[PDB]
Design a protein around this ligand. Sequence first.
Ligand SMILES: CC(=O)N[C@@H]1[C@@H](O)[C@H](O[C@@H]2O[C@H](CO)[C@H](O)[C@H](O[C@]3(C(=O)O)C[C@H](O)[C@@H](NC(=O)CO)[C@H]([C@H](O)[C@H](O)CO)O3)[C@H]2O)[C@@H](CO)O[C@H]1O
Ligand SMILES: CC(=O)N[C@@H]1[C@@H](O)[C@H](O[C@@H]2O[C@H](CO)[C@H](O)[C@H](O[C@]3(C(=O)O)C[C@H](O)[C@@H](NC(=O)CO)[C@H]([C@H](O)[C@H](O)CO)O3)[C@H]2O)[C@@H](CO)O[C@H]1O
Ligand SMILES: CC(=O)N[C@@H]1[C@@H](O)[C@H](O[C@@H]2O[C@H](CO)[C@H](O)[C@H](O[C@]3(C(=O)O)C[C@H](O)[C@@H](NC(=O)CO)[C@H]([C@H](O)[C@H](O)CO)O3)[C@H]2O)[C@@H](CO)O[C@H]1O
Ligand SMILES: CC(=O)N[C@@H]1[C@@H](O)[C@H](O[C@@H]2O[C@H](CO)[C@H](O)[C@H](O[C@]3(C(=O)O)C[C@H](O)[C@@H](NC(=O)CO)[C@H]([C@H](O)[C@H](O)CO)O3)[C@H]2O)[C@@H](CO)O[C@H]1O
Ligand SMILES: CC(=O)N[C@@H]1[C@@H](O)[C@H](O[C@@H]2O[C@H](CO)[C@H](O)[C@H](O[C@]3(C(=O)O)C[C@H](O)[C@@H](NC(=O)CO)[C@H]([C@H](O)[C@H](O)CO)O3)[C@H]2O)[C@@H](CO)O[C@H]1O
Ligand SMILES: [Ca+2]
Ligand SMILES: [Ca+2]
Ligand SMILES: [Ca+2]
Ligand SMILES: [Ca+2]
Ligand SMILES: [Ca+2]
Lengths: 270, 269, 270, 269, 269
Amino acid sequence: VEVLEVRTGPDAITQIEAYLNPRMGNNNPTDELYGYSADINVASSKASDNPNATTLPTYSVAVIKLPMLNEDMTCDTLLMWEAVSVKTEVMGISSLVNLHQGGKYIYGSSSGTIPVQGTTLHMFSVGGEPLELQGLVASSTTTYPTDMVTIKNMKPVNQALDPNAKALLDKDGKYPVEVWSPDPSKNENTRYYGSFTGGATTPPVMQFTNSVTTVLLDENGVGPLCKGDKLFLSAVDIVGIHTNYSESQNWRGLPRYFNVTLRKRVVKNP
Amino acid sequence: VEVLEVRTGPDAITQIEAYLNPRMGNNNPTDELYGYSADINVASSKASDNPNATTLPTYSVAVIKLPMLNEMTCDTLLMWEAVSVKTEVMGISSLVNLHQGGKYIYGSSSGTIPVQGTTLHMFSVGGEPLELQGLVASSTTTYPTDMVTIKNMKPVNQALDPNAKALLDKDGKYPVEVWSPDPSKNENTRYYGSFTGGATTPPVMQFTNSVTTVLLDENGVGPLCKGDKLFLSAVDIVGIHTNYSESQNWRGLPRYFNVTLRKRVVKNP
Amino acid sequence: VEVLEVRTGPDAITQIEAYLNPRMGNNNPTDELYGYSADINVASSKASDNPNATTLPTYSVAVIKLPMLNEDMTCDTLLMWEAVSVKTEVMGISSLVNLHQGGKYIYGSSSGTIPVQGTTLHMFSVGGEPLELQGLVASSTTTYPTDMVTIKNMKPVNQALDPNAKALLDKDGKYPVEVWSPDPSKNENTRYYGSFTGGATTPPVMQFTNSVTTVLLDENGVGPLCKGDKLFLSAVDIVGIHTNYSESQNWRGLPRYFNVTLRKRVVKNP
Amino acid sequence: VEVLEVRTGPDAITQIEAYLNPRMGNNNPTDELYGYSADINVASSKASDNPNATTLPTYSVAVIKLPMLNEMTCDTLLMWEAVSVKTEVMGISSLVNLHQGGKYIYGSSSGTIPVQGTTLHMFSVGGEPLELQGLVASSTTTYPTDMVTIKNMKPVNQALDPNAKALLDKDGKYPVEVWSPDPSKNENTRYYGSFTGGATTPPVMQFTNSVTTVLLDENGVGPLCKGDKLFLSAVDIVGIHTNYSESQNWRGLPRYFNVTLRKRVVKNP
Amino acid sequence: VEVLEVRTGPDAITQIEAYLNPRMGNNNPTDELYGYSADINVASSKASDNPNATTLPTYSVAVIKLPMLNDMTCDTLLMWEAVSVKTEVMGISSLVNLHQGGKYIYGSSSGTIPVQGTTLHMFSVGGEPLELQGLVASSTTTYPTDMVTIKNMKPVNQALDPNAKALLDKDGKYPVEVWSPDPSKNENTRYYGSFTGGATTPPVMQFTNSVTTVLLDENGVGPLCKGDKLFLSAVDIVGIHTNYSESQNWRGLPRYFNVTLRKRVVKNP
Ligand SMILES: CC(=O)N[C@@H]1[C@@H](O)[C@H](O[C@@H]2O[C@H](CO)[C@H](O)[C@H](O[C@]3(C(=O)O)C[C@H](O)[C@@H](NC(=O)CO)[C@H]([C@H](O)[C@H](O)CO)O3)[C@H]2O)[C@@H](CO)O[C@H]1O
Ligand SMILES: CC(=O)N[C@@H]1[C@@H](O)[C@H](O[C@@H]2O[C@H](CO)[C@H](O)[C@H](O[C@]3(C(=O)O)C[C@H](O)[C@@H](NC(=O)CO)[C@H]([C@H](O)[C@H](O)CO)O3)[C@H]2O)[C@@H](CO)O[C@H]1O
Ligand SMILES: CC(=O)N[C@@H]1[C@@H](O)[C@H](O[C@@H]2O[C@H](CO)[C@H](O)[C@H](O[C@]3(C(=O)O)C[C@H](O)[C@@H](NC(=O)CO)[C@H]([C@H](O)[C@H](O)CO)O3)[C@H]2O)[C@@H](CO)O[C@H]1O
Ligand SMILES: CC(=O)N[C@@H]1[C@@H](O)[C@H](O[C@@H]2O[C@H](CO)[C@H](O)[C@H](O[C@]3(C(=O)O)C[C@H](O)[C@@H](NC(=O)CO)[C@H]([C@H](O)[C@H](O)CO)O3)[C@H]2O)[C@@H](CO)O[C@H]1O
Ligand SMILES: CC(=O)N[C@@H]1[C@@H](O)[C@H](O[C@@H]2O[C@H](CO)[C@H](O)[C@H](O[C@]3(C(=O)O)C[C@H](O)[C@@H](NC(=O)CO)[C@H]([C@H](O)[C@H](O)CO)O3)[C@H]2O)[C@@H](CO)O[C@H]1O
Ligand SMILES: [Ca+2]
Ligand SMILES: [Ca+2]
Ligand SMILES: [Ca+2]
Ligand SMILES: [Ca+2]
Ligand SMILES: [Ca+2]
């Protein structure tokens, strides 16, 4: 894909918006606990660790279809959509400002309940193809649900970097975050941005505004280029753990809004 | 509406100032605990969660009527454009207090635990009501009917339901735990918010008169005041006060605004 | 006053320095716990809350006499000193690095003692007149010592913004910080800068250098103008709470240094 | 060597990429706890402190062989000059896991405590081995024989002993708790380091492919690759995993490097 | 002294490097606990507080003698002007150690609590001794007489006594809990300091060789070296080590300095 100049003129710009609902484990909108995982089922040992699919947060992904650009496909150059900038926001942050939800008391039974807190993971990506993933787990002896996309035939090497443990973020709510992360050795045509704070009871911290833009251009001034006129939006927004009265625990996720500006870019015809 | 150029000349600029008092639950100035919520009443289960109206912090909103700009058939009209804002949370040092009745830090010889835990700060300046998206921790919660909440909730309301939208058009009626600013709209409002969770988290706040936020968008256009009305919205939950019996009350603080506005030409629609 | 241009030429710049001692409650330098509050006395209830004067930290304020400027008061223009910039420093920070002071053991009786920690409040202001204050309290039912300056005839409204609850910081060690804060609806002729972290055991965080300057000019390039050739310096620097063996507690404060550079500014005669 | 100007023209730039696997103590890819240390064995006293080799995290290092530049007679020669690097800690989200066997957050119905506590991140890019300075918590520790540590330690080694120097010239052999980058040397390497201590501190990390670090010094010169060899070094201890018995293992993560190099003219010495 | 222009020309620039070992109380390189304080001895009362010399961390200071620049009989003279410094706290990774004898994180199967709690970092570069201000937590404390502390203390010394001044003119003698840099003086020194308190706070430090601090003031003048002497001062308390019995030792680390200096013209006094 030899990249040429930006196409100028009227209607060289377009703009899309989308939202991605979280995939915390309860991933059906009819689910009573939609937006949460089911009760974390903990390993009994190193050898015996079979997390339920409903307990494992996965990446969200959506494909946005863009307007057709080329008529004559036999020419020397073609146009592709180039993602230039994005405004993105985690929605419903203030829903966490809630001390009455059933759960564990902060102090005794006269007090409010512990709000969602603990480990957080926030990531968004904008690309002209699927986000390229690298596999790495806390334990290679974990048995993952066969309906999810995880690493095939793990060995202890998979607790670190195994260069064969690669995948594409090409299915919504299927790739667990505890197995997959963005592959920095690839992703030339995607931009991804991530933030992790761990711990079991850590206070979550989030900002929200409509005044902030991220520019997506690389050091050659080129944004993600949308193969087949498709734009890939990916996210995970784990905002912590909700603790229940029995002390069972559910992951809590929040949806993410994207507003992307794209322009026309000239490329050599492959 | 097609936005044209900034109107120059004498008297092109004006300033307004306002303060919004907090709406934590006790929302009447004669309430003993004005500026606080009542004792949080907790759900007994997923199915049974009936929070009292007085326990749910809501958004503050005020509408500022600006000087009338157009007497109406001319081909262009003028609108007030909010260009910048100085905003401040007032009475921060009020929380620097270890004698207020409450729960002892250590044993009964010590000071009491000051306001701490979850904080939520938001301000917005817009030319029309702030646009809101509904999302809740639990769709089986029964909200007081006197408040404005999501009609006919389903589990989808625990995440993004594009049908759950509203306008912040009433002071002290829209619960913060139910509504947040809608990033898919709000072209004519600028909003800024920060959240830090937890049950005992130390609150952190700055105060100064040296800082200004510029409200202009990427085209150099600030919010434009429809019908010459400026909408100022806020919430500043500064934490949780814990009482001796361990009952808890949200504590809020008031917010000052000083907004500078200029005259903007628009094509008459 | 209508402000005009800066006066150029020789002797048009001056510079002052001052320090302000903290007013934590023990405010007499002969007091045994000078620089600390007395043991905090706690409310027994909502209705019954009578904090002792020696337990309530108050703002520091000093007036600095500047060189007299206007020989002829009938002139159509006059000169005022304009505060341009300030270096300011909290002094004796390292005095907190002390684990042997009598107090509460960190662990058992073999360990050091708990250093000063908890709620901190830092504020400095430079103005050409007294800092204007707004009243707001945790509880309107609190009975304050009568020989302090507080809100007269409080009602529950004073737990929020009562527009009638106003004052000037015109007395050193008289205005409790828990009652008064800088009023953002005025203070046109003062710059103030403030920083709060709460909690009961929070670690204090402080910087110290002689390499940092704060410019006092507003958006029109005008600094505080010193009425009657007087410069007002105000401060509070609560660095936390010292816990005693019996678990009684004292607020701890530190003095603040000011170095202000001023220039002559032409104003129209009123 | 006298350093002259940058060589321009076609084919003057090159990129390499590599990843370094962590060396936490279990350092063989077939080890059950590869990517972790073994259970920490604690000293019985000041005098009796014999940490097992598998319990001591060490630095990672890789040598990248670059294209040969010289066909050695001439007055000037060429060297590879490292200009910039993109680096990334991989598999961060693997820590977002509350079901791994371990210690319960609350009682036995809760999730388990994730990796937390002390973290140490370092990467370096240089034209030769990273130069190290020795300093320990205790000179009466007896280190495993098969590791490289300070010979004939004395109490002076609990602070700066100018004789205690080394080169990071072996992967998984130099303990982090013994060696750190020597700021009095390393003129031909750039290193960047971050430490947060504590027993149970929440780990914090970001990840992106939008960030580049420029390696040029104040004279605009990057590390120069002696013998066409580029040295990449790292450690990324991300915290401690606590087991059900309360035994503890260090946990590390691998680091990706992408380095851009150019040709630099130097005088033939 | 009237300061004139910078001397341009060849050989106008010089560089020095140095390191300062910490003085935490065990200040002798043969001390078993070199680089730490002795076990903190606590006051039994307000009235009775006698910290041992070995439990009180003190400032480090070195004097670097620079090349002689001047004949003293000419209209103008030259002084060395400190222009910039690279500085580094060394052996940071030595804290990354969970096996050192101490207090268990959990029960006796776990690692031990690492150095944590109060930290104090300061460095200064000056052309004469750092000027100090005295201020103490308690005026009734009896300091060791062979240390340099405030003479005849009164309760005024718990705040600002303008008479309580000193010079940092001796290594390992001036306690940090008594003296701090005096902002009312030090026109010929640049000092930079950071404090975080608390008893168990995680320590946080960076290390790199890519960062320089410029020492020029607002007039573009760096510290001027009187009698061709450069003063380097430091303290780097990195936390508290807790022992098995719960006794506690301050822990310090050494600091490296690399200072660049230039020739400055001054009028002969
Ligand atoms: C008489 C009788 O047996 N009635 C039972 C009810 O007791 C039961 O209600 C559930 O009972 C739990 C008792 O430990 C608990 O009160 C449930 O409420 C919560 C919880 O605390 O666990 C409230 C939480 O807010 C909720 N979690 C979330 O919404 C997100 O984290 C959890 C959650 O729904 C469950 O834990 C599932 O993971 O429930 C309370 O609902 C009822 C249902 O089991 O059955 C009756 O017959
Ligand atoms: C024998 C008897 O019943 N006597 C009652 C008093 O008990 C009662 O006074 C109230 O008593 C409480 C005992 O736990 C408590 O001491 C009340 O003080 C506080 C509190 O700690 O709860 C002080 C708090 O500062 C205050 N909270 C706030 O202002 C904001 O968070 C609370 C608050 O007013 C209440 O918790 C209600 O939400 O009160 C003390 O007032 C008295 C009044 O009912 O009646 C006596 O006869
Ligand atoms: C032989 C005998 O019994 N003598 C007694 C003394 O015991 C007594 O001295 C005081 O004893 C207290 C025991 O509860 C305590 O140790 C006092 O020391 C401290 C304190 O911990 O309370 C030390 C603190 O550093 C100090 N606080 C500050 O300086 C700033 O926070 C406090 C403070 O002075 C008091 O708490 C008052 O606020 O004191 C110790 O002085 C002696 C005096 O009561 O009486 C003898 O009979
Ligand atoms: C019936 C019977 O006795 N079976 C035994 C098993 O008990 C034993 O399995 C091990 O049992 C341990 C009992 O405390 C423990 O539960 C082991 O699980 C963990 C652990 O918590 O220690 C799970 C951890 O996630 C894992 N740690 C890591 O992977 C990284 O920190 C550790 C780790 O594998 C070991 O502790 C090594 O330090 O194990 C559980 O595996 C079994 C094997 O010993 O032997 C059976 O006969
Ligand atoms: C079998 C028997 O009786 N053995 C004893 C030894 O136990 C004893 O050694 C000392 O024993 C102490 C018991 O509390 C303690 O374990 C000493 O180790 C430590 C400590 O935890 O106190 C280890 C610390 O790392 C070290 N601190 C530092 O290095 C820096 O902070 C401290 C420190 O050296 C002392 O606390 C002095 O302040 O020591 C352990 O050495 C032995 C000699 O005492 O005598 C045998 O008979
Ligand atoms: Ca690649
Ligand atoms: Ca829209
Ligand atoms: Ca006003
Ligand atoms: Ca050197
Ligand atoms: Ca002076």
